[PDB]
Amino acid sequence: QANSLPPGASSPIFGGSTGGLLRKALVEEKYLITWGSKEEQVFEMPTGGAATMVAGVNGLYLARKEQCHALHRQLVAKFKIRDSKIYRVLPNGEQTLIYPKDG
């Protein structure tokens, strides 16, 4: 509904936490990390708890860009995943690439 993924990305399995999105994501900005995984494996959320992600392309909306870049360094330092892309999602639906900026 309000948090719609881009096509090609699937939601990782998560039970939902209270560390996630607040009103700012509705009204000012939110962020989205999207990465590729070769299996269904278990990672730690940057907002608390533990999630698992399926094989393929996974996407997750977070409140801050530091939360996405912390999830990116966790994927690098724990499961060697280096194709994470970070978008800044505006409330009207506009997505712009802010990591990696050089491509």
What residue ranges bind another protein (CB under 8 A)?
Answer: 1-3, 11, 14-25, 27-29, 42-50, 52, 60-67, 69-71, 73-74, 98-102
CA-to-CA separations, 77 to 1, 18, 74, 80, 101, in angstroms, rounded: 33, 26, 5, 6, 21
Q: Tell me the closest approach of the beta carbon of residue 36 to another protein, in angstroms.
A: 19
> Nearer Cβ to another protein, position 45 or 81?
45
Q: Which of 56, 62, 103 is nearest to 81 (CA)?
A: 56
Q: Tell me the closest approach of the beta carbon of residue 100 to another protein, in angstroms.
A: 8
d(CA 78, CA 2): 31
Q: Tell me the closest approach of the beta carbon of residue 67 to another protein, in angstroms.
A: 5
> Nearer Cβ to another protein, position 5 or 36?
5
